[PDB]
Write a protein that binds this ligand. Structure first.
Ligand code: GDP
Lengths: 152, 179
């Protein structure tokens, strides 16, 4: 099951209650409550979503920024295969994408449907941003593979 | 011409099926609730000088399986939340019905996605959920329009679906699906 603390984290992150989120994170940082910051929702209202997925999808920037500052994993996957970046890009939230990209989100991750974040968005500025980063990550990955294969 | 998909959600027994038949067939009957429930049901209506075909999906199948809700809610244009005015437990669940819909239907603009809330069965005694309480909740959720209804006595059923369609049509005019 989920702990009361991480049920509070899922609820406040989904609802954009930024001060309650931040207070929880300070308690979790000081090891005064049991709560995984990367917890997966376990209720009907959030099954398989992390607090970070919820806040990106519903557009709560202060929550996202506190979760990222607190060490949340940028590349968590939900039951659909989505990263938080898929959700922010799908909903056309340019600044959230900037933040996720800034915390080194992997853009090459393909969701359950076969789609990267670049190709679930309808905002042309986000698409361009993700295309630039994806090509950059792809080239860096291909050279690391090619090197590591030419040389054990 | 244009097609609107409408989801109807709520704990079983709030009157979802009965509201459907009242809107569409002008009748109070919840018969065949395992063939049209968890199934479409259709009505050509006129919506602000636009001829709409409205598909109304009953959730009465209501399988816990999240896998159902994803493709079932997929591409919904409006979502109608229903509770029993005489059953307070059915009003408390509206939060998770709305949330479950939003993360499974996954519309591009959740904060503006058109919901309507129906407090059904207002033709009874001992209505245990107060009007002001439900309007407080509805406005809390970005001013969802709220109606008290009776599928049995046909009260505010047509009115609510006029609003449903209108608001859904301002959201489907953003995507465009004619026929
Ligand atoms: N008095 C009254 N009873 C209703 C009303 N709407 C539905 N019901 C009754 O409540 C029960 C729930 O009906 P149903 O439509 O099957 O609920 P569903 O499972 O939510 O689809 C049925 O026995 C209906 O006769 C209403 O507006 N007024």
């Amino acid at each position: 099951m989920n702990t009361e603390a991480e049920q509070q984290l899922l609820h406040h992150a989904r609802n954009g209650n930024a001060e309650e989120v931040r207070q929880l994170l300070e308690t979790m940082a000081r090891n005064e409550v049991i709560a995984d910051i990367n917890c997966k929702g376990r209720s009907k209202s959030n099954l398989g979503w992390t607090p970070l997925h919820l806040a990106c999808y519903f557009g709560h920037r202060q929550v996202v920024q506190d979760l990222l500052k607190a060490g949340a994993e940028v590349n968590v996957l939900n039951d659909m295969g989505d990263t938080p970046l898929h959700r922010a890009a799908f909903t056309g939230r340019k600044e959230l994408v900037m933040l996720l990209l800034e915390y080194n989100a992997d853009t090459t991750i393909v969701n359950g449907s076969g789609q990267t974040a670049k190709e679930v968005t309808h905002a042309e500025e986000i698409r361009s941003m993700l295309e630039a980063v994806e090509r950059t990550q792809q080239r860096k990955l291909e050279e690391l593979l090619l090197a590591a294969a030419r040389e054990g | 011409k244009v097609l609107l998909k409408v989801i109807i959600l709520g704990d079983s027994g709030v009157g979802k099926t009965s509201l459907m038949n009242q809107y569409v067939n002008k009748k109070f009957s919840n018969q065949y609730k395992a063939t049209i429930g968890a199934d479409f049901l259709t009505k050509e209506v006129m919506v602000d000088d636009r001829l709409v075909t409205m598909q109304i999906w009953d959730t009465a199948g209501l399988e816990r399986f999240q896998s159902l809700g994803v493709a079932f809610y997929r591409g919904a244009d409006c979502c109608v939340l229903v509770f029993d005015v005489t059953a307070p437990n059915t009003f408390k669940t509206l939060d998770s019905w709305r949330d479950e819909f939003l993360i499974q239907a996954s519309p591009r603009d959740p904060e503006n996605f058109p919901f309507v809330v129906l407090g059904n069965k207002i033709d009874l005694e001992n209505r245990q959920v107060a009007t002001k309480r439900a309007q407080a909740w509805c406005y809390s959720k970005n001013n969802i329009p709220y109606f008290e209804t009776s599928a049995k006595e046909a009260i505010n059923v047509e009115q609510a679906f006029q609003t449903i369609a209108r608001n859904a049509l301002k959201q489907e005019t953003e995507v465009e699906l004619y026929n």
